[PDB]
């Protein structure tokens with residue numbers, strides 16, 4: 649019925665259409681077509697790949713189910729170190745942070761505020777638009793190469809919107825809903841439950857069998873451009889927008905604040921909205937918006953001087 653020639657062509661058509669649908673459903677959290685439309689096309693692709701396995705590609709949506717089983721994780725170095733954040737706990741801590749920033753820069757500074765997603769910090773590297781490496785923060789200079797596991801995280805693009813080479817960083821986490829379902833499953837199988845979604849995400853990414861990881865329903869939020877490649881963003885707020893543009897999932901609750909007072913209002917706003925979110929957050933991350941100014945402030949041994957994480961009590 650279908651020759652190798654026709655199938656080879658049709659397979660690419662399906663991957664493109666299905667990947668667009670997944671981008672809308674998983675990355676934008678806003679599907680355009682009904683599930684049955686996706687399922688019908690997905691099945692057609694599975695049928696083609698089953699008949700001619702040589703047509704299976706790394707960016708085919710059928711690969712999301714995983715299948716590879718590792719013996720262990722390779723070391724994943726971070727030539728551009730993955731620092732951690734300095735903490736703040738009181739309104740005075742946040743204002744003190746602002747005072748230090750102003751003292752160093754010499755003028756009022758705008759801040760890009762984001763929710764502190766409670767999960768595992770990860771780094772994603774793309775080459776010519778192709779996903780080539782996924783890694784945990786680990787100790788900051790060396791983490792674990794969890795590329796295969798991240799291929800199963802539905803919101804992680806296997807091929808970017810543009811064939812660019814960049815390295816980005818964000819959080820990989822488990823939504824409350826999935827955390828609950830998972831613990832119930834572990835209770836059913838006589839296993840120890842996970843204390844919180846953070847530990848659930850960490851344990852999930854430590855699994856060597858990708859098939860298991862694929863079922864953990866992990867998700868992502870990207871927030872840092874480590875290796876810009878051709879990206880043009882000059883501020884953090886611009887970077888979040890650009891991360892979205894090239895195909896990554898970004899958190900929609902960020903806000904650019906012109907004053908420390910607006911920053912505190914943001915903190916209080918989301919401090920009370922906290923329980924309404926589908927994911928857990930342990931605070932707010934306040935970042936100097938201008939990259940030029942972030943560069944001026946630099947980093948201590950432990951963290952950047954241009955950011956602070958307000959931790960919820």
Ligand SMILES: NC(=O)c1ccc[n+]([C@@H]2O[C@H](COP(=O)(O)O)[C@@H](O)[C@H]2O)c1
Pocket residue numbers: 669670672673674679680681682683684686687690709712802
């Ligand atoms: N409507 C859509 O665009 C869309 C995209 C991806 C997955 N889904 C749904 O997500 C579920 C899981 O499918 P996948 O594992 O192929 O991502 C299915 O129920 C599927 O229909 C829907």
Ligand SMILES: NC(=O)c1cc2c(=O)c3cc(F)ccc3oc2nc1N
Pocket residue numbers: 730731732733762763764765766767769819871872933951952955
């Ligand atoms: N958990 C988070 O949602 C979150 C975490 C970090 C970091 O750990 C982080 C570490 C750095 F060295 C620099 C910026 C950062 O920005 C961050 N931004 C976020 N939104």
